Amino acid sequence: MAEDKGRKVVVSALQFACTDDVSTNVTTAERLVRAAHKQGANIVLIQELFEGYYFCQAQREDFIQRAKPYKDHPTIMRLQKLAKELGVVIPVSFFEEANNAHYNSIAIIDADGTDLGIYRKSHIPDGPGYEEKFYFNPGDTGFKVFQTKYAKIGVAISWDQWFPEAARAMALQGAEILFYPTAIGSEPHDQSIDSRDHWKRVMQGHAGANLVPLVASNRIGNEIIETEHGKSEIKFYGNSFIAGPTGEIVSIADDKEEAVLIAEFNLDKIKSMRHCWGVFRDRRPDLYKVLLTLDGKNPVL
Amino acid sequence: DKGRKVVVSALQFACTDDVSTNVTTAERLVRAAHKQGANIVLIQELFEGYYFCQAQREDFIQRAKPYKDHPTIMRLQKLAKELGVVIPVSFFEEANNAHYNSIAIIDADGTDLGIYRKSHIPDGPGYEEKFYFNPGDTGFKVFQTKYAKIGVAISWDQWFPEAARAMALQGAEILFYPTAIGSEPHDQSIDSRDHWKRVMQGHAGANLVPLVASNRIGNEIIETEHGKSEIKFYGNSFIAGPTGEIVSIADDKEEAVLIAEFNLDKIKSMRHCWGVFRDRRPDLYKVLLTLDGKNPVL
Amino acid sequence: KGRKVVVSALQFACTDDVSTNVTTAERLVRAAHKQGANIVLIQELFEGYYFCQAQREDFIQRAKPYKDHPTIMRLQKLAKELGVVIPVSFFEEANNAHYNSIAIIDADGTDLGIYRKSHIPDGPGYEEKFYFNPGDTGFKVFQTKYAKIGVAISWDQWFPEAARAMALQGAEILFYPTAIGSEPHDQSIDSRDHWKRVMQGHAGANLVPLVASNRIGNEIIETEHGKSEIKFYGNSFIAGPTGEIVSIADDKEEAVLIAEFNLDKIKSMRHCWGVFRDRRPDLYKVLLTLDGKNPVL
Amino acid sequence: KGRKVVVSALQFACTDDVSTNVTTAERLVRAAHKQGANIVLIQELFEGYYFCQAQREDFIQRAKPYKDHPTIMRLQKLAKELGVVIPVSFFEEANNAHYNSIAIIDADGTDLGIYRKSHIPDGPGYEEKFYFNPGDTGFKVFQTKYAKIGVAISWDQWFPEAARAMALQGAEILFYPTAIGSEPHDQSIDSRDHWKRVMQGHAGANLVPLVASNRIGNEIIETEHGKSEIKFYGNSFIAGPTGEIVSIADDKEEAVLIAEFNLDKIKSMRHCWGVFRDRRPDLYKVLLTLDGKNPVL
Amino acid sequence: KGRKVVVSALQFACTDDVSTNVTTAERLVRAAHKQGANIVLIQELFEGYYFCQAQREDFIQRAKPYKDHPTIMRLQKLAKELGVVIPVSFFEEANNAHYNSIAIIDADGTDLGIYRKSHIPDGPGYEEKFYFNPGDTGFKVFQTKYAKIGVAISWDQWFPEAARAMALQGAEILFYPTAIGSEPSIDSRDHWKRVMQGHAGANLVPLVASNRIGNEIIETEHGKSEIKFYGNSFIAGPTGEIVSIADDKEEAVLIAEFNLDKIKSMRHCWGVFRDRRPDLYKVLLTLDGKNPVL
Amino acid sequence: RKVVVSALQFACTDDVSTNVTTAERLVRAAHKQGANIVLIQELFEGYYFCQAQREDFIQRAKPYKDHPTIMRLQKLAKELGVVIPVSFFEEANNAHYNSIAIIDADGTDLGIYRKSHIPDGPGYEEKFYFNPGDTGFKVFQTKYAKIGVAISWDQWFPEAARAMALQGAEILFYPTAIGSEPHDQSIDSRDHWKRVMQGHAGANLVPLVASNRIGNEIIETEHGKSEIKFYGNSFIAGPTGEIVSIADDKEEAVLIAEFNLDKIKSMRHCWGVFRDRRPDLYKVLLTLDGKNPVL
């Protein structure tokens, strides 16, 4: 009796705490990637801006200079080594310097060690605790998919995950799995804001509407940043998870543990399911021009 | 709790294949909803009869009727005006040689505010809608009622984030989806109800607007061109709030009246402060105007 | 005297094995070339059975990318070896979209592009809407070594708008690869005469010849509700520029049909007759509605 | 000899009451009119305190739609009465988008349309990116009774690209209503000389006059993390077409600045100077990057 | 703390004898170095009188090729001897085309490449196109031992786009060798400085300008033309503030130290480059404000 | 801005290459007489073929794209530095037009205008050949000036001149081929033709240029020989309508008038008639029958 045929891929969401020291956090990442591969993982997802604290609680001049070029990046070069050694795909999130522009970016490292390129975060959040608009130009790559040894994947970043347009754009270009490294928690100006359920439901919705699985890796722990106006704290709420192509959660972490989440998907069965459900056959792009507005009337240039 | 408040309702009932029975059933539940305080009441898809799209039959097409002087619409305008409630009326539209799965929005004073024509048309065993309906040519609309600016789409439209975003971008404060979905006659292992909820809950959370879904219940057996075909409609009518939470839900067999109050001033303030509309990137969305990921449609 | 072009319609039966059917196509293309053909037309979805009687998940996966398609690549070699133009019908996968498509191969083997079927039929026996996104190429014409040609697919042939669109853009000949027969739900529907008249109208109205290649044979497909059967009724034909039939096959024979046209003299006939001079696009806005009143977005 | 135009920059301190502040605008506009002004410029967001020191939910709901805006409508009445052109800065709600916008009223009261602020500043004291979508009108010029003018907003004034965009589309005069002062996290920043120089640069590069109107006063805002204070530094000015300052206000008093320009003489001095006939747009592609290599989508 | 760099603007009067002028350039480069200069700017076309003033067929001879240029080669030796970066303005012959050009020499004497003057006035009061084709290099930056630098030439000075183009590409200091004066009505010295302070301010990069001084009489098609070049060479900082300036009549050696790391951090925090909108800048690739050029 | 303009008036054979030799040699004399903008008569590539309605004549038409004649008149436009409008019979897929291409002084081809008003009747069976044009009226900005180019029968319609002058036209231009009628030798149209055009100039305050064919022409039709005598009277009119240079009905002519156009924009702008117009009252000009707007 034969196994069910089709390409299988094992994916992983990792969840951990960071210090504001880069060598410590990269060592933490190698360790969890290694544990993930030991559980059979093929593609492994590390959370947003893992090289340090989530520094965007402050709006500081000196924190802008934590950016580094994409070219010859020490963290990327090191994880390229790991990727080739274990035979796994590793997206690497980093703060990019590009002449006078800066971006929250992610380089996709393939399972032979090859850097396949970058995605630059398109949607940039703002407000207390999450002052990203001060640091990052809005991304200019557009939504991208990457052909890896195991799959065509879509990778976007954190706040991108709240936007249906991004998931769909990746899916229309052939993405077979979506990946969202993330940094999200409490909000220092209002301790009654607890966004964790809202956060999951919106992404489950992307998974179900595009009929693709979806991986989110989010940070844990409390971090305190010195700001222009005193110290500010966020408690990162974990809840890393993996969802299947109906938006079912197949694996989930809690709000405090370090975790290695693992799941297997038959990409050929899911392809077949995605097409028979028919949503991509029935879409109406002739009726979607209003999505190219911000205000419901006026197309942007 | 200061601000403009509005009470919405999802209804859920079984249909026969006789229009008079079904409209009497609708009148009964609209009155029950109003009794419980409702301002806007949502009746399910194609509620005038059995869900006839299980078959592909010449005679079934001639069930359509013109938007103009439609008797079912005209009768609920009288009810809308009597109770001062907004009532969207789903009907099978004939428009010269075109046909549409449509919906007419009656305001609380009985005024017909216009129509929306279903945009996304499903197909497959049990749900052969592409055989009857021209794909919709109104575009996604919003309507200004006495109580709120609302966005109404139809059934299968509910699977498409593009449709919810289009209504929200145009100022819709609450979304409405009358529906008819159940089992599928070619495969008894398909159970879409959780998948169906999750995708709608995602629209509500991504646009931060409340969302109302009225779905049919009961078994319906149609005589098709190839023999009997049966669907069991699974109910699960629900109301979701602006973060995607279910605040009110029905099971898969009970007749129901569901009721929720929403404060639109607070929800507006919340939707804006969360920031997604401030942060969208239409400059990077051109690929949504493709089907194949490469070629923009004409 | 003037530019002459010999066209051909092919009519044959299919199994559901690709290699068999392509072998068949190749055999008939060669036979037409031996009789002088420059442009040879193979029927719709000739790679296998007309599977659209069913609405099946597994049949959707018969589709294949346009890129490096093994059937198009095979027939490019044949085009080249023969110096003929060969429109190649295939079921296209393009990411999550799917189309009933056709690639136009020039007489030097060059893939000149594609047209994605625009009008998608539906109903018992012909459940095409389940399988194909409505085409997004628009109507096209293709400059080949012999002629500017307009190629659309099957059900497109019932629409005068398609023919007109092609002719306005310079098509000098129209081609319609086709799959059409009886209807499994009503044995009394016989569409063959109706089908011809409508196509003859297009030919007469635009003053351009027209070529239609249709399938033959009984096909029995297993569907969600049991067996379903179509007898395909052949009647592949070539019409001239006043819509007269110059060549026609019966409803069961395998056939190779040949006809020669003087394209310069037809052009001059088409201009002289006046219609493209007298068209009133100022008064045709209603054709951009479905319902006779509301223009589509 | 030629078309003369008298333009004015206004400068004043704002209170927390809308209708008080619009009356303040009315009084200074009347005073500019009396001294002969044809086009009068009011500072940015003059309806109230500069609220952008804070990032607050409730402050967002201070926005109002462009349609039937009561401050725009009141100012239309005044433009018509006095025969002056008045651009009106306001916080726009447009369904779920919000912008920092300006409506250009013509000397007969006619509302010519709006520009939405393109470049949105950020940082302590000036958290504008929390409130405004980046503008989607693009740079505009408006044809008024007296002159084609280019109006942009505040932070837009640091970008040579905006001033050039407007001059290329025919602006004869540039206007920049502004709100700028000290910064709450660093009392060592005094940007007023820098801010002047950058604008004087635009005037001189395009050979067009330029008007800037800036707020004065200390404003304390209750933020999400406590009181934050800006001292607005005035220095409203008018510059000539070589970038010379012809009129300038101090850092704490109300002012009405007046300057006359001969627009036909300046136009002629611009054509002669030839910079526009000598530009190299074939070499300017890199301006469509952020990072000096990748063109934006 | 940070990379500190000393830059210099030189100003002198030219004779119309080449050896004399190159000897003058060398004397003043050495003097800049003696005061600590790391990068030294010589004014445009310094090997002689400013001749674009005449429409003389004979002055076309003065152009020499980029390859093996006697003046460039001599200045290469001096760059390598003193450890200083020297951009060298010259009149380039290249194959039936001619350009107003400049070649960047690094502190080790390496020839890092060439920029060609992009904007060429077809004015009613010059036929400069007579000598120079419009440049085909586009705007460049060169990585030197001390800094990334952008260099442009004479009329380029007027064009905000050229300064922005160099800045987008990492230029940390801009250099503008020029030559400007007028007949013995108005004088453009303030207009010039204001436009240039403008570019430094908008890009938050320091900016060095070297302009000649002196009267010069050339015989021409009509007869005599005379120009009094007005000097005012200057160095400006990253907010456009003038930190050193020359007068209209004497030789000068201007010196200023910049901390390029502090300036980088200031430039990025001010935020102009984070906030640019290239999606709304297309009209800049038109001449007439409506039609794109090729 | 002192622009010089010319009307030309010459004989045609039915031979493309020779006729192009005559335009060549009269354009050259225009330019030697100081001409900036030089006009060439309608369908000058051969005889006025529209006396017959024959199928083979429709096939005289040519694509706009890489047109033999356009391309040669472009080399010459470039070399002399003169602006030259070029009449030709246009093929466009199955459509056909009576069309004109405006060539600037650097040889630059600036775009086409397509004859809007199509004559009909004996000798002038133009409705048989030409689709009514779909370009609209057009003003081409050239190096020398904003110019208004329409074709032949267009000269009869005040709306066409008025439309061109609302769009910035400083000069109007009309290449033409009119003369005797073959059905009725009593009909003399030369004074009537001159006068209608003079009434436009006056009404818009813009100079006007009408170039026209001379010489006799027999065409073999579907019904026998057919003869027009083309009467010239190629003329330049000023902005009051006064004719300033006028050719005869018989001989080859090179006309010239200098105009101070910045001075004529002042005469016009100051006369007040454009701002005096009442477009709220002109809806009736969008009907054919005097009450039903056309769709």
Author numbering:
A (entry chain C): 1 to 301
B (entry chain D): 4 to 301
C (entry chain E), D (entry chain B): 5 to 301
E (entry chain A): 5 to 188, 192 to 301
F (entry chain G): 7 to 301
From the paper:
The arginine route involves three enzymatic steps: (i) arginine decarboxylation to agmatine by arginine decarboxylase (ADC, EC 4.1.1.19); (ii) deimination of agmatine by agmatine iminohydrolase (AIH, EC 3.5.3.12) and (iii) hydrolysis of N-carbamoylputrescine (NCP) to putrescine by N-carbamoylputrescine amidohydrolase (CPA, EC 3.5.1.53), with the release of carbon dioxide and ammonia. N-carbamoylputrescine amidohydrolase enzymes belong to nitrilases, and more precisely, to C-N hydrolases breaking non-peptide bonds using Cys-Glu-Lys catalytic triad. The octameric MtCPA enzyme is assembled into an incomplete helical twist, made by four tight dimers with swapped C-termini. As in other nitrilases, the substrate hydrolysis is carried out by the catalytic triad, composed in MtCPA of Glu48 (proton acceptor), Lys121 (proton donor) and Cys158 (nucleophile).
Instead, we decided to construct the MtCPA-C158S mutant. Substitution of sulfhydryl with hydroxyl group preserved binding properties of residue 158 but strongly diminished its reactivity. The structure of unliganded MtCPA-C158S, determined at 2.39 Å resolution, presented significantly lower noise in the electron density maps around the active site when compared to the unliganded wild-type MtCPA. This improvement allowed to identify the ligand bound inside the active site as GOL. However, GOL does not penetrate deep inside the pocket and presents no direct interactions with either of the residues from catalytic triad. Instead, it is hydrogen-bonded with the side chain oxygen of Glu187. Considering the fact that in the MtCPA-C158S mutant structure, GOL enters the active site, and mimics the substrate or product, the niche-bound GOL quite likely might represent the secondary binding site.
